[PDB]
Nucleic acid binder design. Structure first.
Ligand SMILES: [Mg+2]
Ligand SMILES: [Mg+2]
Ligand SMILES: [Mg+2]
Ligand SMILES: [Mg+2]
Ligand SMILES: [Mg+2]
Ligand SMILES: [Mg+2]
Ligand SMILES: [Mg+2]
Ligand SMILES: [Mg+2]
Ligand SMILES: [Mg+2]
Ligand SMILES: [Mg+2]
Ligand SMILES: [Mg+2]
Ligand SMILES: [Mg+2]
Ligand SMILES: [Mg+2]
Ligand SMILES: [Mg+2]
Ligand SMILES: [Mg+2]
Ligand SMILES: [Mg+2]
Ligand SMILES: [Mg+2]
Ligand SMILES: [Mg+2]
Ligand SMILES: [Mg+2]
Ligand SMILES: [Mg+2]
Ligand SMILES: [Mg+2]
Ligand SMILES: [Mg+2]
Ligand SMILES: [Mg+2]
Ligand SMILES: [Mg+2]
Ligand SMILES: [Mg+2]
Ligand SMILES: [Mg+2]
Ligand SMILES: [Mg+2]
Ligand SMILES: [Mg+2]
Ligand SMILES: [Mg+2]
Ligand SMILES: [Mg+2]
Ligand SMILES: [Mg+2]
Ligand SMILES: [Mg+2]
Ligand SMILES: [Mg+2]
Ligand SMILES: [Mg+2]
Ligand SMILES: [Mg+2]
Ligand SMILES: [Mg+2]
Ligand SMILES: [Mg+2]
Ligand SMILES: [Mg+2]
Ligand SMILES: [Mg+2]
Ligand SMILES: [Mg+2]
Ligand SMILES: [Mg+2]
Ligand SMILES: [Mg+2]
Ligand SMILES: [Mg+2]
Ligand SMILES: [Mg+2]
Ligand SMILES: [Mg+2]
Ligand SMILES: [Mg+2]
Ligand SMILES: [Mg+2]
Ligand SMILES: [Mg+2]
Ligand SMILES: [Mg+2]
Ligand SMILES: [Mg+2]
Ligand SMILES: [Mg+2]
Ligand SMILES: [Mg+2]
Ligand SMILES: [Mg+2]
Ligand SMILES: [Mg+2]
Ligand SMILES: [Mg+2]
Ligand SMILES: [Mg+2]
Ligand SMILES: [Mg+2]
Ligand SMILES: [Mg+2]
Ligand SMILES: [Mg+2]
Ligand SMILES: [Mg+2]
Ligand SMILES: [Mg+2]
Ligand SMILES: [Mg+2]
Ligand SMILES: [Mg+2]
Ligand SMILES: [Mg+2]
Ligand SMILES: [Mg+2]
Lengths: 147, 141, 117
RNA sequence: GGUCAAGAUAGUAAGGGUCCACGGUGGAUGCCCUGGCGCUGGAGCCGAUGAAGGACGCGAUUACCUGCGAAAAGCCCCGACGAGCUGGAGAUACGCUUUGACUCGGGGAUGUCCGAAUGGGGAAACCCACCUCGUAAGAGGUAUCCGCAAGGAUGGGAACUCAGGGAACUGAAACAUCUCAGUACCUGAAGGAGAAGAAAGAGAAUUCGAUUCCGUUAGUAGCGGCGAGCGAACCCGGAUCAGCCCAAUCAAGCCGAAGUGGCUGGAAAGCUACACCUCAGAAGGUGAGAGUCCUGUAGGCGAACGAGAGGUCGUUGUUCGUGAAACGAUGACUGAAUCCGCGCGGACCACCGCGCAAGGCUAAAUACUCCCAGUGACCGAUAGCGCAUAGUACCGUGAGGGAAAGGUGAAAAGAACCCCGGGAGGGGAGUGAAAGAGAACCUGAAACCGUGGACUUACAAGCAGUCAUGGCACCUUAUGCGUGUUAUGGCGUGCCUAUUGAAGCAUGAGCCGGCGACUUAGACCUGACGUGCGAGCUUAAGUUGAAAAACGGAGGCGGAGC
RNA sequence: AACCGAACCUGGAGAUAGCUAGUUCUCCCCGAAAUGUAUUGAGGUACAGCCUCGGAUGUUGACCAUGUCCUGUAGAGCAC
RNA sequence: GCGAGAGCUAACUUCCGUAGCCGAGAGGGAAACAACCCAGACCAUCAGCUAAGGUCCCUAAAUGAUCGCUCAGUGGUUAA
RNA sequence: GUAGGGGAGCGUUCAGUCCGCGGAGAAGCCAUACCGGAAGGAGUGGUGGAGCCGACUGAAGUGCGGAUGCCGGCAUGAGUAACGAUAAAAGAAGUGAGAAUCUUCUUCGCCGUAAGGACAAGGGUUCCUGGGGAAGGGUCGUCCGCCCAGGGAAAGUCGG
RNA sequence: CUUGACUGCGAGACUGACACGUCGAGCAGGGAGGAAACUCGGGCUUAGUGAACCGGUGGUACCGUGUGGAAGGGCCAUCG
């Protein structure tokens, strides 16, 4: 908002020449080469999504920070039960752990945990996994997601 | 955070100007010129002031679209395809895909094992060398 | 995200202004004149490194010339008879001998002359 | 040792110079947020029952703001809250309220004057009326057009939509067809969207089947001083689906788990030893960083009221620039058939196909974003809107232009009181952790002005440096390669830009801060590096889920040239 | 309505600008061009020529002797 | 500098050709001096030999050696 | 080694992530003789008062001496020029913290078809009383057309 | 005496930044003069020229939009 109007004399003043006050070299004026609204997103080709995901799992298997899980004894949706179960599978408390299951109860148990994250069903990604120390595997959709 | 990027898979851009290091002044542009100017349009076919080769030359013919024919090759019905036959959708679910065009079969390779074809048209030497190796060619009505 | 100069410029600048001291007027106090003064100063440093290599050589020389002449010898003749008897002395040293060590210069003289004739 | 003689060198600084110490000026920088900015989503009209927007008023004291309207910082009724309240505003005195105030949600009542203004006039907010009822004080009515009446219209709305009107600069390296572009702007109307819509259609398969939207076909078919340049559609995938009739749950609120001991500290939330909660570890406040103080969150409840035809002539539209010009479209002339009929299939003819003109409405997907909310590899005081707020100050007869503005402390505990002065200002005291925070109140850069100190400077010629040596001074990366300063020497043509050639008597610039310029987009082109699959490679629109991503073959690239 | 051969304001609008300025971090390697040819073109653009990077190739380059043909200048001469 | 043209065997002249140089080249020399003579600066050294060009003092280095010339300050700016 | 192409990197922010520091003190700022081939980066000391360094990776409004550049501050010129008509001032008296300038007195000097008086247009409390003195006043001010507070304006015949 | 002042071509080179331009053996169809071997796709040669575009004209039956036709268009020729 700095109206077009020629400001003063094109020649004559003894001053440098200007046109508007809306200009890159002016305090107040508009920015030259600024950022605008865009979107840095693209479509990374399928192939390498799959190969990554995999390579992550793997990277943590030969770790070996995998814990392939077939069950969960965490009473009714309570957190302390999570902490206990955890304690007895090898979960000291000094790592970041990423749940993948399908049972609402286990998550509801796994949520408030400062040292743990709760990824539901499929929404799994090289990030979260590498983002962490441990994968709560689980087991169900692992050998069947193999095939 | 573990990771790292493939050596040479990301080149850091050029920010021209900035020092004598460095690309001093000018910004690649040299001293003066029409090229020197913050302004679009030049463009790419603008030779001289002038009149261009481009428009100095004979306009021959015109532009007909026409029916253009989809290639099928001998050495592709041949070798290790082990005749699952051509059928219709079958060759499609293999390695000859377009739609809204007619398929043509023509030579290139050699011929052995007997096969019957299912194409929209074909070359003389093709029907010739495929019958002479044990199989027909189905041309529509 | 935008990134003001914030800090960097003051940094660069001070660097110069700390190189820039002892300098007379504005030179030691305003950036532009400072950095500038230093461009030229650069020229003078480089050249005057090799230069002092010349100048000292000159100094040694005149001291030896003296020495020679202090008896009856020319510089050129002394130094030449000190090439002839192969007495391969640096001339910096020769100056040293000449001005801090009398009777030694005496002998080196008698030598050069002997080897000359 | 005195006199004379010859010769050599010292000290003083009016002032200045270099360095150092110490303030001043100023307000860069760091920190912070009370203000922005964009994206997603929600929500979307007001008004003759007087709108937007104002003028003047209402206060114990009232200039600005805010709220309000002569019932005038408020009034009645209901509902939530339960202890404070008496607007920012920080001030006294007056008071109010557990019979339930204040604040919140929800209706009502009162609402001067101006403004579509509308009883008539008027230079908006003022002047003068006429009529009906009243005892007066008052109250109502008195515009204009459509109407029998009842009733509707007038004016406003950032953009969004439709329509009547319709530029130029520009580009074609000149210009005129042409391009800019039916763009800017003007105007009309209307809504929360609108427009469009139920085939004389696309069309070429004897296929689809109202429209609008996106993907795609596709920079393909074509247009063009065949120059610049301009550029479809059918099909294929999605979004959302509709076709009807006539003329012979959110909006106030409530309820919600679980820690203490010692330690540093001005201050605990931090350190520590042991604790418990979690469907609650999102966040914010508390003397410095709190899962377990507070407000909250997960969760659970949740209201009386509340919200869901043809032809001819001049032309033009689509890719349509008179080109073979079809068709629609209208200005002026003409104005046929109605079923064994009418219209189209890009001149025109037969054939053979697709179609029912002359009558109307239509949700849905779509566009926008004044406003509300959520987020952020968006900004934090030259940024960010113009504004930490203000369209104000200021300029302009007017249209219109239009600023800089931020920070005491944890809390005012805001400095009683003594001292010099009329004061201003300061020096104590006293508070605080700190007054190295004291209201010109966070840091406090640099230019710039000064006090003190070191070493120097009054026979000297200078881009102000360099380099060598001597002097003097200093000793916290620092007693040696030293550091500060200096005398003497050698040497030496500011920087930038512009150029055949710059110290140039050629351009620029007082100095220092801070802002200041090779970028973004497209799923275009072509290359280099890399990667994943590899005679194979790949999705887009969308769909679903979304503290993540998967689905999506419609199309694209390779496949064979001429 | 304080500068009228075409008011001022807002807007298209960041019109265009073959023109003039300006274009900031550092070290290393290479390293030009102001010639030709066209151009409503002459202080501007196209293509070559010249730089540089990289993939191919293999001594094809370069100077120098030899051998071998082409020439009509310097000098000279008066045969047109 | 050498070749020629236009000029006036004028120009810090202009238009070609040709070699080198500056342009884009610092260092020594020519007092001073883009072009000239020597020479192509990867840093360090208070180390040595040379080039052009120099060796009375300024100013490094023979006031050198022998056979001579000019006496005019020629040297240290021109001609019939 | 100029235009130019190539090579490796220094610093700035925002971001993901880890190492981790901080009221026995963060960033920022200030001094310095250390280190790195350079962009740069460390040690310690003084400042400050609540936040921040480092490694790896990602994205940029990413590095200024120039543009007669823009905003702001402060320098030069300089204690210079000027203090706005050459109608002209003196002495006494008073007041005050302070007086060439403000208030009395007595004179002098200037206007007098004005430099007097009354209206209109315009301005808007500038009027009067009491007070103030930061700034406005071209010096000074105890004074004012400036600051504060309070008062003042009256129509049937003037004017609409 | 004659119509090589010829169709269909083009080995290989000169030349030019490009576009052009220049020479040409030889092959075919089919000719001309010689009795023949032969020679000829213009003149002793080097000047006697104008790219595209839009259009006229003589062939040609490649395109012609539901289909078969015609407009129109393409190709060879050519004229401005
Ligand atoms: Mg000036
Ligand atoms: Mg580069
Ligand atoms: Mg330039
Ligand atoms: Mg040039
Ligand atoms: Mg040497
Ligand atoms: Mg003094
Ligand atoms: Mg008000
Ligand atoms: Mg109530
Ligand atoms: Mg309450
Ligand atoms: Mg009332
Ligand atoms: Mg009225
Ligand atoms: Mg024009
Ligand atoms: Mg033009
Ligand atoms: Mg309207
Ligand atoms: Mg017509
Ligand atoms: Mg038209
Ligand atoms: Mg028609
Ligand atoms: Mg600041
Ligand atoms: Mg601002
Ligand atoms: Mg005081
Ligand atoms: Mg001093
Ligand atoms: Mg003297
Ligand atoms: Mg002296
Ligand atoms: Mg520069
Ligand atoms: Mg010049
Ligand atoms: Mg000068
Ligand atoms: Mg100059
Ligand atoms: Mg000039
Ligand atoms: Mg590749
Ligand atoms: Mg005028
Ligand atoms: Mg425009
Ligand atoms: Mg402009
Ligand atoms: Mg080289
Ligand atoms: Mg030239
Ligand atoms: Mg080129
Ligand atoms: Mg060779
Ligand atoms: Mg001759
Ligand atoms: Mg010239
Ligand atoms: Mg040049
Ligand atoms: Mg040189
Ligand atoms: Mg030289
Ligand atoms: Mg010299
Ligand atoms: Mg010269
Ligand atoms: Mg010699
Ligand atoms: Mg000497
Ligand atoms: Mg970070
Ligand atoms: Mg920070
Ligand atoms: Mg500047
Ligand atoms: Mg000037
Ligand atoms: Mg004076
Ligand atoms: Mg003066
Ligand atoms: Mg004077
Ligand atoms: Mg004076
Ligand atoms: Mg006066
Ligand atoms: Mg006077
Ligand atoms: Mg008296
Ligand atoms: Mg008194
Ligand atoms: Mg007076
Ligand atoms: Mg008067
Ligand atoms: Mg008065
Ligand atoms: Mg005053
Ligand atoms: Mg008084
Ligand atoms: Mg044309
Ligand atoms: Mg024809
Ligand atoms: Mg025809």
């Amino acid at each position: 908002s700095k109206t077009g109007r020629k400001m003063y004399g094109q020649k004559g003043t003894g001053n440098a020449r200007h046109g508007d006050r809306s200009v890159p070299t002016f305090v107040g004026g508009g920015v030259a080469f600024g950022p605008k609204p865009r979107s840095y997103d693209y479509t990374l080709p399928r192939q390498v999504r799959q190969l990554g995901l995999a390579m992550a799992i793997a990277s943590r298997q030969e770790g070996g920070k995998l814990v392939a899980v077939d069950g969960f004894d965490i009473a009714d949706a309570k957190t302390k039960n999570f902490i206990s179960w955890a304690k007895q599978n090898g979960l000291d408390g000094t790592e970041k752990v990423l749940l993948v299951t399908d049972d609402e109860n286990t998550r509801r148990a796994a949520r408030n945990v400062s040292w743990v994250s709760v990824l539901p069903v499929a929404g799994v990604n090289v990030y979260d996994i590498l983002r962490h120390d441990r994968l709560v595997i689980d087991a169900a959709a692992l050998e069947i997601v193999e095939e | 955070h573990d990771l790292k990027p493939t050596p040479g898979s990301r080149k850091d851009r050029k920010r021209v100007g900035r020092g004598p290091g460095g690309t001093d002044k000018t910004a690649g542009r040299g001293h003066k010129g029409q090229k020197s100017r913050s302004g679009a349009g030049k463009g790419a076919f603008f030779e001289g002031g002038r009149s261009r080769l481009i428009a100095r030359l004979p306009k021959r013919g015109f532009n007909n679209v026409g029916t253009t024919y989809e290639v099928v090759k001998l050495s592709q019905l041949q070798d290790l395809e082990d005749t699952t036959f051509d059928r219709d959708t079958l060759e499609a679910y293999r390695l000859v895909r377009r739609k809204n065009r007619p398929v043509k079969l023509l030579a290139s390779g050699e011929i052995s094992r007997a096969v019957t074809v299912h194409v929209d048209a074909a070359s003389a030497a093709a029907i010739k060398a495929v019958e002479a190796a044990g199989g027909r060619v189905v041309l529509p009505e | 995200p935008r990134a003001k100069t914030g800090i960097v410029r003051r940094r660069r600048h001070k660097k110069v202004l700390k190189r820039a001291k002892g300098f007379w007027g504005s030179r030691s106090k305003q950036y532009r004149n400072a950095f500038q003064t230093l461009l030229n100063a650069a020229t003078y440093e480089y050249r005057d490194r090799r230069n002092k290599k010349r100048d000292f050589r000159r100094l040694w020389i005149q001291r030896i010339n003296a020495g020679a002449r202090l008896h009856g010898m020319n510089y050129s003749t002394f130094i030449n008879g000190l090439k002839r008897a192969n007495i391969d002395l640096n001339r910096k040293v020769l100056a040293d001998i000449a001005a801090r060590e009398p009777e030694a210069f005496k002998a080196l003289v008698d030598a050069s002359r002997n080897a000359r004739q």
